[PDB]
Amino acid sequence: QELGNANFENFIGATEGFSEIAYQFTSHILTLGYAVMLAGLLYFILTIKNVDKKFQMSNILSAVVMVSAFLLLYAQAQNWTSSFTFNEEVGRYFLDPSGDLFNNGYRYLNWLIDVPMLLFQILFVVSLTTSKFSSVRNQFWFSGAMMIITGYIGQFYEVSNLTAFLVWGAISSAFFFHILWVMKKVINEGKEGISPAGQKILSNIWILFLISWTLYPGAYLMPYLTGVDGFLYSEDGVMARQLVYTIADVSAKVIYGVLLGNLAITLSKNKEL
Amino acid sequence: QELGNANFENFIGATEGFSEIAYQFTSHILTLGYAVMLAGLLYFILTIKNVDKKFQMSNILSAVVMVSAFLLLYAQAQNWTSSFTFNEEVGRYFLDPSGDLFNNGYRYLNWLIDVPMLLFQILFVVSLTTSKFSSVRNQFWFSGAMMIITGYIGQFYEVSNLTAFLVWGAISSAFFFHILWVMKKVINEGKEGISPAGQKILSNIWILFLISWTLYPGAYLMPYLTGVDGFLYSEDGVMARQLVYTIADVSAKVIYGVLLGNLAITLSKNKEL
Amino acid sequence: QELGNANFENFIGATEGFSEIAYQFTSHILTLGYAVMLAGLLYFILTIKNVDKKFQMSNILSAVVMVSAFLLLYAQAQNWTSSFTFNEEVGRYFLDPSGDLFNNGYRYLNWLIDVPMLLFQILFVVSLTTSKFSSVRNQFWFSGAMMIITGYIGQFYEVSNLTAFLVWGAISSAFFFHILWVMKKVINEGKEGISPAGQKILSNIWILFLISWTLYPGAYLMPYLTGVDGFLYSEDGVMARQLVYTIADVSAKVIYGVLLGNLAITLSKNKEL
Amino acid sequence: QELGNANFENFIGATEGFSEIAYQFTSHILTLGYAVMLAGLLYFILTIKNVDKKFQMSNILSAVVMVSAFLLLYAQAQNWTSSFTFNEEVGRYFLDPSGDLFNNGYRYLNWLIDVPMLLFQILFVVSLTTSKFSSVRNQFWFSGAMMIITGYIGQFYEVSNLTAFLVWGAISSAFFFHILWVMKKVINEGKEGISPAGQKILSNIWILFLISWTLYPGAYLMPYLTGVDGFLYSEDGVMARQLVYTIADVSAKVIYGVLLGNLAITLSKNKEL
Amino acid sequence: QELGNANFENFIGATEGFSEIAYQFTSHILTLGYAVMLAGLLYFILTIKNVDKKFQMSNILSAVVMVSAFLLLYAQAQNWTSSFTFNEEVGRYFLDPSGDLFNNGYRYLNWLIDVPMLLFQILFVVSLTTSKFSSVRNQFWFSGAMMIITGYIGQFYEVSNLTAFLVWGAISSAFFFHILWVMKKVINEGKEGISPAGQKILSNIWILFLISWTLYPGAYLMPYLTGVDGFLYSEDGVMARQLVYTIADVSAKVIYGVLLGNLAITLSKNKEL
Ligand SMILES: CCCCCCCC/C=C/CCCCCCCC(=O)OC[C@H](O)CO
Ligand SMILES: CCCCCCCC/C=C\CCCCCCCC(=O)OC[C@H](O)CO
Ligand SMILES: *C/C=C(C)/C=C/C=C(C)/C=C/C1=C(C)CCCC1(C)C
Ligand SMILES: *C/C=C(C)/C=C/C=C(C)/C=C/C1=C(C)CCCC1(C)C
Ligand SMILES: *C/C=C(C)/C=C/C=C(C)/C=C/C1=C(C)CCCC1(C)C
Ligand SMILES: *C/C=C(C)/C=C/C=C(C)/C=C/C1=C(C)CCCC1(C)C
Ligand SMILES: *C/C=C(C)/C=C/C=C(C)/C=C/C1=C(C)CCCC1(C)C
Ligand SMILES: CCCCCCCCCCCCCCCCCCCC
Ligand SMILES: CCCCCCCCO[C@@H]1O[C@H](CO)[C@@H](O)[C@H](O)[C@H]1O
Ligand SMILES: CCCCCCCCO[C@@H]1O[C@H](CO)[C@@H](O)[C@H](O)[C@H]1O
Numbered sequence A, B, C, D, E: 001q002e003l004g005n006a007n008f009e010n011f012i013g014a015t016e017g018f019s020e021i022a023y024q025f026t027s028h029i030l031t032l033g034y035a036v037m038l039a040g041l042l043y044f045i046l047t048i049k050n051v052d053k054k055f056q057m058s059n060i061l062s063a064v065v066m067v068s069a070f071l072l073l074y075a076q077a078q079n080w081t082s083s084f085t086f087n088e089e090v091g092r093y094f095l096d097p098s099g100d101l102f103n104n105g106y107r108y109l110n111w112l113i114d115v116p117m118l119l120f121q122i123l124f125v126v127s128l129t130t131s132k133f134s135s136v137r138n139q140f141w142f143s144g145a146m147m148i149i150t151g152y153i154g155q156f157y158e159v160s161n162l163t164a165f166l167v168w169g170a171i172s173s174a175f176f177f178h179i180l181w182v183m184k185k186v187i188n189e190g191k192e193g194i195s196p197a198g199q200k201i202l203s204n205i206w207i208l209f210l211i212s213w214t215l216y217p218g219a220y221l222m223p224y225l226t227g228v229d230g231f232l233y234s235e236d237g238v239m240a241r242q243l244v245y246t247i248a249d250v251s252a253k254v255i256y257g258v259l260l261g262n263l264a265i266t267l268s269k270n271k272e273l
C-alpha cells in the first residue's frame, strides 16, 4: 500500500494488524491519559486558594495545560479507534484509511501550549538570583518552539526517510539540551535562600523534570530502539510508545504541577504544609 | 469467528446474541452509572465548604474520582451500543466488530486513578495513631497499582486461557488482601479519640468498603461463578457483571465519599450534622 | 418482524411508521425535555445563596436531579432519532433497527437517582414533628426503589405479555401508594409551626406532587388507555406518552424544586418573597 | 416523493437543491446563532454581581434562556447539515432524508422556555404601579403558551395546507398582540419613579422588543412574503428565514438581557454605569 | 467536477489531493487553534479578580471571545476531516463531498462576535480624552460589520470569480483602514495620563493589533500571493492559510487579551505585577 510520510503505527496496522490486546491497551492508555488531565484540571482549580495570591498564577497555568492536554489526548483516543478496524476473518485490527491515518503529530503541535507554559510557570514560584526573568522566559520559549517544530517535521519521516527522521531529531535534541541547561540554572537559583522543605521539593522537581521530559525523545525513537526488525518494530512498539507518552504526560504535567503547588504552599507566608 | 484474547461478552454476542432485555438493560445500567458519577461530581464540589478547611481535600479527591468515573462509564456505555447490533431476522443483538470488541479493560486502567485516590482521601479525615501517613499512602498506592495491573492482564484471558486468567487473578487477590489489611488498621486508628457518632460512620465505611471492593473480583469471576456452561455463562452473566460493576462503582466511589464527608462534618469544629 | 420484549413505539414504527408530525413532535418534546433540565441545573446552582445555609442542601439535590435528568433525556432524544428513519417512497419514518430498538427503560433506571433525591430533599426544608427523619428517608428510598424496579420489568412486556405488564404494574402501584401516604404525612408535619404563606406553598407542592407523579403510571398505560385497537395504540399514543413524560418531568423535578426553594426563602431568617 | 406536512426548506432541497452559498450561509448563520448564546451565557453569569441582589434574578433568567437557546440552535445547526447532502453531478445540496427532514418546529417548542422567561425577567427589574405582578405574569405566560402552540401547529402546514397555515398563524397573532399590549403597560409603569437614564433604557428595550419579536411572524411567513412563485419561495427565502431567526434570537434574548442588566445597574444603590 | 462558488481548498482536494503532511498538519493546526481558545477561556475567567472592578469587563469580554473562537475552530477542525478522505490507491486525501465542501466562511460570520468585542473591550481599560466612548464604539462596530460582511461575500468567489473576489476584498479593506485609524487614536488617547509601564504595553498592543489583524487579509489572498499557478496555489497554500489564521487568532484574541489584562493591572490602584 502507498502510505507516504506516515507514522509506523499505520504500517504495522496495514501489514500485520493489531491483536485484541495491542489495540485495546492502546485505546485504554490513551483514555486514562485524557481522564487524568480532566481530573487534574479540577484539582488545580479547586486548590488555587491554598497558596498566596502571588503563587496562584502557577495553579492557573497548570489548569491551562490540563485543558490543552485533555482536548488533545481525547482527540487522539478517538483517532486511534477510527484508524484501526476489526477484520473478522483473521481476528486482528487493520488500518482503516476512511478514519484517516494515525499521526502522533497532534501531540506535537499541542506541546506549543504545554511546553512554554510548563517552563514559564516555575518562574512564578521560585525567585531567580543572577538570571533575568524575561531572559529565561525568552530562552525557554524560543528553544521550546524550535524543539517541537523540528521534532514535528522529523516524525513524519520515521518510516519514509530514516535520515530526515534522525537529523531533525538531532537538531531537536540540541534545543532540548539548551532547555535542560536553563531549567537546571533556574532550579539552583530557586533553591538559594529558601527553607529546606522548599529545597527538597525543587530537588524532586528537577529529577521529575529530567526523567519525564527525556521519555518524549524515547517515544520518538521507540520503533527503532531494538534496531532493524527488532522486538519494538511491531504492535509491542506501538503499545510501548503510547504508554511512554502517557507516563510522560502525567509526570511532566500533573505531578510537576502538584509539586510546584506544594512548593508554593511552603513558600506561602500564611499557610503551612 | 476468531476473537482471540477477548472478553466473554463478545463470545455470547457472537454466538447466541443478546435479547432485547439483556442488551437494553446493560445499556441502561451503564447509563445510570455515568449519570450518577456526574451528579456526584456536582454534589462534592457544592458541599466543599460544609467542612473545615483541613477536610476539604477529601471533597476534592471525591470530585477527581467522579471525573474519572464519569468519563470512563460514558465511554463504556457508548462501547456497549457500538459493539452489538440488532439482527432483524431473529430479533437479537449480535457482535458488530466494526464497533470494536467490547472490553472491560477500560475500567481497569482508570482504576489507576480511582483506587489510589479513594484510599488516599480517608487519610485526610481520620488521624492515625500508630501508623505514618506517608507509609500507609505508599502501601495503598503500590499494592493498588499491582492489584490493578495484574488483574488487567488477567481479564484478557478470561476465555482464551483460563489458567492465566486464574493465576493473574490470584496474584491480584494477594495485593487486594494487603489493601484490606491496611484499610482496617486505618479505620481502627481513625476511630481512636473521636466522638461515638464518628466511630459509627467509620464502622459503616468499613462495611461499605469491604463489600463494594469485593464486588470487583466478583465481576472478574462472574461468567464462571456457576461453573462451566453454567447459568451465568450467558447473556444473564453479562447483565450481572455490569450490574455488579455499577453497584460497586456507586458504593465504592459516591456513597463512600458521602460517608467521609459526613465524618468530616462531625469532626469539624464549626459545623454540625 | 421479530421484536420480542420491546416497547410499543417499535411496533407502530415497524408496521405503520410515523408521519412527519408524529416523528418531529416526539423529537421536539424530548429536546425541550433535556433543555429544561440543563436550564434548571443553572437556576438551582445560581440561587443556592438565596436561602439560609441549612436549606441549601435542597438546592444542591435539585441540581443533582437536573444532571441525571439532562443526561438521560439527551440520550433518549438521540435514541428516538436513531431508531426511526425516513422512507422516501411512502414519506413516513419506520423502525431502523441499526439504531437499536427504542426503549423507555432508560428513564426508569435513572429514576433510581431522581425519585430518592426528590423525596429526600423536602426533608431539608420542612421540619418533621412526630416522624423520624431517618425513618421517612428509609421508607421513601425502599418503596421508591421497589416501585421503579418492578415497573422497569413490567414495561418490557407492554406488548409481548400484557399479563406480566399489568401484574408488575400493579405491584409497582402498591409501592407508589405507600410513597403518596408518607409524603402526605411529611407535608402535614411540614405545615406545623410555619407561616400561612409557607403552608400555602406546601399545599401547592402536594397538589403538584400528586398530579405530576401520577402522570408516570399514565405514560406506562398510555397505549392501552383507549383499550384494544384504540385511538392511542398508534403514533398518536406514542406522541402522548412522551408529552406526558416531559410534562411530568418538568413538573416533578423543576417546578417542585422551585417551589421548595420558595418555601426555603419564606422559612429563611434573612429573606422575604 | 411525498414529504407530507414538512417545512418548505425540504421542498426546495428536494427539487432545485441549494447552491454552495445558500447551503453554507444557512450553516454559518445557525453556527453564529448558538455561539452567540453560549458566549451570552458566560456574560450573564460573570456579570451577576454587577447589580444589587434584588436584580440578580434577571441575570439568572437571562442565563437560563441562553442555555435553552444554545442547546436548540446547536441541535438545529446539526439538523441543517444532516438534512442536505452534496450531489457531485450537478454541484448542489439536495434533501437527504436519511438525516430526517428539516423542521423549524425545534425552535417553537423551546420558546416555551424562552418566551415565558424573557417576559418574566423584566418584572425583577422594574416596579409595577397600577398592574399586579401575578396578573401580568399570568397573562404573559398564558398568551405566550397559546401564541407558541398555535404557531407550532401552523408551521407544519406551511406547504401542505396554506389555509391551516394562515388560520393558525392568525390565531397566534392575536395572542402576540395581547403580549405586546401587556409589555407596553409594563414598560410605562417601569419608567415611573426612576432616573431619566433608566427611562431611556426602557424606551430602547421597548423598541428592541417590538422589532425583534415581530421578526418571528416575519420568519413564519417568509416563503410567501413575495406571494406565489415569488423570489422568496426559493433558496433565497430559506437563507432569509434563518437570518431573520438569528437576528431575532440575538436581539430578543442577548441584547434584551444586556439592556435589562444595564437598567438594573442604574437602579442599583451602589453602582454607577 | 462542478464545485461552483467554493473555496480553493476544495479544488486542490478534488484535483491533486492532499499529501499526508498537508492533510495532517491542517488538522493539527486547527486542533491547536481551538485548544488554545478553551485554555484562554479558563485563563481569563481565573484572572478576573487580578484587576480593579472597573477593568473586569475586559476579562469578561476576552472570555466571551474565547467561547466564540473555541466553538468555531472546533467546528472547523471537524469540517476539515469530514471534507477530505484518504484514497488507498494513490495515498492522498481527496475531496469527499458527502462531508460537505470546506468553507472558511464559518470564521467570517463568527468574527461578527469577535471583532466588535475585541475592539470594544479596550474601551474598558483605557480612558479616552478628546474622543467620545459611544462614537468610537459605533465606528468600530459599523466598520467591523461592513469589513466582515463584504469579505464574507468576497471569499465565495475566490476561485469562481476573481474579479468579485478582489473588488469585495478592496471594499472590505477600506473599512479595515478606518478601524486601524480609530484604534490608533484610541491607543494614543489611552497613553495620555498613565505610567510609562502602561504606555509601553499600549505600544505593544498597537504593534500586535496591526500585525495580527493584517494577517487576516493575508489569509484571504493567500492562494494568489505567488500569482497564477504559483507555489501557494497548492496544498502548501492550503497549509499556509490555516497556519496564518491560527497565528492571527492566537495573537489577535488571546495575546491581545493578556496584554490588556496586564495594562489593567498597572492601572489598578491596589495591584502590582
Ligand atoms: C459608508 C457606507 C458604504 C457602503 C459600501 C457598500 C458597497 C456595496 C456595493 C457593492 C457593489 C460591488 C459588487 C462588485 C461585483 C463584481 C461583479 C463582477 O466583477 O462580475 C464579473 C463578470 O461576472 C464576469 O467576470
Ligand atoms: C474601493 C473602496 C470604496 C469603498 C468605500 C467605503 C469607504 C468606507 C470608509 C470609512 C467608512 C466610515 C463610516 C463610519 C461612520 C459610521 C456611523 C457612525 O458610527 O457614527 C458615529 C456615531 O453616531 C457618533 O456617536
Ligand atoms: C507536556 C508535554 C511535554 C513536556 C513535551 C515535551 C516534549 C519534548 C521534550 C520533545 C522532545 C523531542 C526531542 C528532544 C527529540 C525528538 C523530537 C521531540 C520533540 C519529541
Ligand atoms: C472505583 C473502583 C474501584 C474501587 C476498583 C476496585 C478494584 C478492585 C478491588 C479489583 C480487584 C481485583 C481482584 C482482587 C482480582 C481480579 C482482578 C481485580 C483487579 C478485578
Ligand atoms: C423525576 C421522575 C419521577 C418523579 C418518576 C416517578 C415515577 C413513578 C411515580 C412511576 C410509577 C410507576 C407506577 C406507579 C406503575 C407503573 C410503573 C411506574 C414505575 C411507571
Ligand atoms: C427567544 C424567542 C422568542 C422571543 C420567540 C418569539 C416568538 C414569537 C413572537 C412568535 C410569534 C408567532 C406569531 C405571532 C405568528 C406565527 C406563529 C409564531 C409563533 C411564530
Ligand atoms: C478574532 C478575529 C479577527 C480579529 C478577525 C479580523 C478580520 C479581519 C481584519 C478581516 C479583514 C478582511 C479584509 C481587510 C479584506 C479581506 C476580507 C477580510 C474580512 C478577511
Ligand atoms: C515578550 C515575550 C517575547 C517572546 C520571545 C520568544 C520568541 C518565541 C517565538 C518562537 C518562534 C519560532 C519561529 C520558528 C520559525 C520556523 C523555523 C523552523 C525550522 C524549519
Ligand atoms: C536508535 C536510533 C538509530 C536506530 C536506527 C535503526 C535502523 C532501522 O532500520 C530500519 O528498520 C526497519 C524496521 O525493521 C526496516 O523496515 C527498515 O527497512 C530499516 O531501514
Ligand atoms: C474460581 C471459579 C472459577 C472456576 C473455573 C471453571 C470454569 C471453566 O469452565 C469453562 O467454561 C466455559 C464456558 O462454560 C467453557 O467454554 C470452557 O471450555 C471451560 O473451560
Ligand SMILES: CCCCCCCCO[C@@H]1O[C@H](CO)[C@@H](O)[C@H](O)[C@H]1O
Residues within 6 Å of the ligand: C162, C221, C224, C225, C227, C228, C229, C230, C233
Ligand atoms: C387498565 C387498562 C388496560 C386495558 C387492557 C386492554 C388490552 C388491550 O388488548 C391488546 O390491544 C393491543 C393493541 O390494540 C393488541 O395488539 C393486543 O393483541 C391486545 O391484547
Ligand SMILES: CCCCCCCCO[C@@H]1O[C@H](CO)[C@@H](O)[C@H](O)[C@H]1O
Residues within 6 Å of the ligand: D162, D221, D224, D225, D227, D228, D229, D230, D233
Ligand atoms: C400574508 C402572506 C400570505 C399570502 C399567500 C400567498 C399564496 C402562496 O401560494 C402558493 O405559492 C407556492 C410557492 O410559490 C406554490 O407552490 C403554491 O402552489 C401556492 O399555493
Ligand SMILES: CCCCCCCCO[C@@H]1O[C@H](CO)[C@@H](O)[C@H](O)[C@H]1O
Residues within 6 Å of the ligand: E162, E221, E224, E225, E227, E228, E229, E230, E233
Ligand atoms: C492582489 C493579488 C491577486 C493576484 C491575482 C492573480 C491571478 C491568478 O489567476 C488565476 O490563477 C489560478 C491559479 O493558478 C488559475 O487557476 C486561474 O485560471 C487564474 O484566473
Ligand code: NA
Residues within 6 Å of the ligand: A080, A081, A082, A083, A084, A085, A086, B098, B099, B100
Ligand atoms: Na476501531
Ligand code: NA
Residues within 6 Å of the ligand: B080, B081, B082, B083, B084, B085, B086, C098, C099, C100
Ligand atoms: Na447497538
Ligand code: NA
Residues within 6 Å of the ligand: C080, C081, C082, C083, C084, C085, C086, D098, D099, D100
Ligand atoms: Na432519524
Ligand code: NA
Residues within 6 Å of the ligand: D080, D081, D082, D083, D084, D085, D086, E098, E099, E100
Ligand atoms: Na450536509
Ligand code: NA
Residues within 6 Å of the ligand: A098, A099, A100, E080, E081, E082, E083, E084, E085, E086
Ligand atoms: Na478525513
